[PDB]
Design a protein around this ligand. Sequence first.
Ligand SMILES: [Ca+2]
Ligand SMILES: [Ca+2]
Ligand SMILES: [Ca+2]
Length: 89
Amino acid sequence: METLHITKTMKNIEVPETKTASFECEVSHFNVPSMWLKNGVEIEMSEKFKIVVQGKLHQLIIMNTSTEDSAEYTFVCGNDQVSATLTVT
Ligand SMILES: [Ca+2]
Ligand SMILES: [Ca+2]
Ligand SMILES: [Ca+2]
């Protein structure tokens, strides 16, 4: 029928320091866990990183960006994973 897979990939993004950035990923199925990675390290929800789901849409909101947040961000689902880069300023 249908594999559990990523249906729409993420986009590279640049924002000025201290502003908010985001990444979005769309997947095939509902109730998928939001497996977000920063340089391969699992991201935990905090005051800074917001992990948001709307049905098949998954979004990482990165608030109060600093230079250090310039990284590769990854979404994992099925046997897929997609990545994009954040450049801060
Ligand atoms: Ca600066
Ligand atoms: Ca800085
Ligand atoms: Ca997997």
